[PDB]
Design a protein around this ligand. Structure first.
Ligand SMILES: CC(=O)Nc1cccc(-c2nc(C(=O)O)c(O)c(=O)[nH]2)c1
Ligand SMILES: CC(=O)Nc1cccc(-c2nc(C(=O)O)c(O)c(=O)[nH]2)c1
Ligand SMILES: [Mn+2]
Ligand SMILES: [Mn+2]
Length: 181
């Protein structure tokens, strides 16, 4: 699984996933499923940011925490939007909202509701993808065009297959419930 991740995702994403795990004192060598999930989520976040017109999205995720807060602060003080209680993943300049991107090996609506109650925010848009082609977004407002969302769905289903063909998918799918509980 470790070797799969390092050859499945680009080095910059891997690099960012390792740092993110190290900042919490976890070992990517041991917790390989979380390592995969982190890289996947990052990859989705960057695909998403790319889905829009050139300067539409501020990227919050993938940054060191402190600088991430500084940027959020800057957007809040300059747009009027309320300060979220937790770090979101992006800010949409077109729609004037933050976005939380979720990626789940379980049901989109279950994950959506976990996100929505943790944040307790009526401003932050939530957008969940699954490894089975579905998506759920706040108010059924998907933000991007179908083309950009479709590319992401395809990439996720390709990760699932490459996992399965290596015997890694079961453990990866099962793992999320364990993480939750
Ligand atoms: C789950 C996912 O792909 N998104 C995402 C982003 C950042 C972190 C995690 C995450 N993923 C797992 C996991 O094992 O799946 C955890 O146990 C955990 O604490 N966090 C997941
Ligand atoms: C709830 C769950 O199943 N996994 C999990 C656990 C802890 C954290 C995260 C997570 N964490 C972040 C984060 O920014 O830390 C995300 O953007 C995200 O989508 N998911 C996901
Ligand atoms: Mn995040
Ligand atoms: Mn997220």
């Amino acid at each position: 699984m470790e070797d799969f991740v390092r050859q499945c995702f680009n080095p910059m994403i891997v690099e960012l996933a390792e740092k993110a795990m190290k900042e919490y004192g976890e070992d990517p060598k041991i917790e390989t499923n979380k390592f995969a999930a982190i890289c996947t989520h990052l990859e989705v976040c960057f695909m998403y940011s790319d889905g829009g017109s050139k300067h539409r999205f501020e990227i919050i995720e993938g940054r060191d925490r402190t600088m991430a807060w500084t940027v959020v602060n800057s957007i809040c003080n300059t747009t009027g939007v309320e300060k979220p209680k937790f770090l979101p993943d992006l800010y949409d300049y077109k729609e004037n909202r933050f976005i939380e991107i979720g990626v789940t090996r379980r049901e989109v609506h279950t994950y959506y509701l976990e996100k929505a109650n943790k944040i307790k925010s009526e401003e932050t848009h939530i957008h969940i993808f699954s490894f089975t082609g579905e998506e759920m977004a706040t108010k059924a407002d998907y933000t991007l065009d179908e083309e950009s969302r479709a590319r992401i769905k395809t990439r996720l289903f390709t990760i699932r297959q490459e996992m399965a063909s290596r015997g890694l998918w079961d453990s990866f799918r099962q793992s999320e419930r364990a993480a939750a509980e």
